[PDB]
């Protein structure tokens, strides 16, 4: 059934890293995008 219980096990290891790498890198990128929108200043200054 799971001889790759060895082999597949191996892959899982890299997975642990990929996310830990990407997941941050991903999240970053997301923030990297959204950041400006975060801080926006839009003014309600109705005339008079």
């Amino acid at each position: 059934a799971e001889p790759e219980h060895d082999h597949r096990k191996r892959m899982g290891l890299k997975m642990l890293l990929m996310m830990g790498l990407l997941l941050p890198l991903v999240y970053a990128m997301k923030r990297h995008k959204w950041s400006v929108l975060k801080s926006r200043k839009l003014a309600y200054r109705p005339p008079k």
């Binding site: 799971e2 597949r8 990407l22 990128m29």
Partner: protein, 378 residues
């Protein structure tokens, strides 16, 4: 000019994903959707590749299964895996239902009924599709839903024949459902683009609940990248449960070869199919059971018809929320209820759970709605 603007197929495209203006306030409620399709795609994808090897032949059942499993390298992985992934699709499915619910998104009918088609569709489309393994669980259980084919007055006998192909479930079925699976996914797909365009029409709601025209951006970058994220989250999910403990969710009765004489003790549905079979065995009558079944989602249709409050977001409606997570309590409640075989306490237990479903939705949730209204005073 800008081909992005210009190209007609693109003209759809930009209009679809790209140029798409969308509520800026948008909330994580999203992700699941693309997931599902990704899921769906992968679903097909894998199934396809799966199909590529797998045979669905009577003698081949466990046989090819071994060839598709014991032989099949990563047929291990792809097989058992994306098999689990199905269940994941169910996960975001029920989830997503929640999404609309606490959303209260029920405002958009054709969408709602659409995903209702998606609902029962997903249900059996699985079930048949699911059963394809023809495993001892799915086998005596095949005698089960096979015995579901007989319900009607004057018909089922002839029906569960026609359904069943004849005097019982058979290789007849094997082909029958086997195909039925082969077809239905496509149905899901076109259904999808359908409900999709339906969406793009109205646009759609917002977790805020206010008219969105105030604030919109395209999915790119925002909802786009966000989506990419949630995808990675998925591969975490799927590629996790898969990657680590594939069998964790299983029921050993599957790996049990179908043994026509067997009929063992258990007879349960999938964590996907779970909450039903409890609901099924709950009542002591045929169409009670069924009409209940279709009356759960159908019930949800009524819920859109039952929509009451002068405000969309239950966010502002706390007592409502009590009914919300409470209703959920009734739900996974119904799970663990099914989580027992027929038992003395359980009898009463689920027996009341139904009332809840009828109350906690049809009464207590609507009654709740009226109440909150009364309180509203504005």
């Amino acid at each position: 000019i800008n081909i992005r603007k210009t190209h007609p197929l693109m003209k759809i495209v930009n209009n679809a994903f790209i140029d798409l203006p969308a509520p800026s306030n948008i909330s994580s409620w999203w992700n699941f959707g693309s997931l599902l399709g990704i899921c769906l795609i992968l679903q097909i994808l894998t199934g396809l590749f799966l199909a590529m090897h797998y045979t669905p032949d009577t003698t081949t059942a466990f046989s090819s299964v071994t060839h598709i499993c014991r032989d099949v390298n990563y047929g291990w992985i792809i097989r058992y895996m994306h098999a689990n992934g199905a269940s994941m699709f169910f996960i975001c499915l029920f989830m997503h239902v929640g999404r609309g619910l606490y959303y209260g998104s029920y405002t958009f009918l054709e969408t709602w009924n659409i995903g209702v088609i998606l609902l029962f569709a997903t249900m059996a489309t699985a079930f048949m599709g699911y059963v394809l393994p023809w495993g001892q669980m799915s086998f005596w259980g095949a005698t089960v839903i096979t015995n579901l084919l007989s319900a009607i007055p004057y018909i089922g006998t002839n029906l569960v024949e026609w359904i069943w192909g004849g005097f019982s479930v058979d290789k007849a079925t094997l082909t029958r459902f086997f195909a039925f699976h082969f077809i239905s996914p496509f149905i899901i797909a076109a259904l999808a683009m359908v409900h999709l365009l339906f969406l793009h029409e109205t646009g759609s709601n917002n977790p805020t609940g206010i008219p969105s025209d105030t604030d919109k951006i395209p999915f790119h970058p925002y909802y786009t990248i966000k989506d990419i994220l949630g995808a990675i989250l998925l591969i975490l999910i799927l590629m996790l449960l898969v990657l680590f403990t594939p069998d964790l969710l299983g029921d050993p009765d599957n790996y049990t070869p179908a043994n026509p004489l067997n009929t063992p003790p258990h007879i349960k549905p999938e964590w996907y199919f779970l909450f039903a079979y409890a609901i099924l065995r709950s009542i002591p009558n045929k169409l009670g059971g069924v009409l209940a079944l279709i009356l759960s989602i159908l019930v949800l249709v009524l819920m859109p018809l039952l929509h009451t409050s002068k405000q969309r977001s239950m966010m502002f409606r706390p007592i409502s929320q009590c009914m919300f997570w409470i209703l959920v309590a009734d739900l996974l409640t119904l799970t663990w209820i099914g989580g027992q075989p027929v038992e003395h306490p359980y009898i009463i237990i689920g027996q009341l759970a139904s009332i809840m479903y009828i109350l906690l939705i049809m009464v207590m949730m609507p009654v709740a709605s009226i109440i909150e209204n009364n309180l509203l005073k504005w």
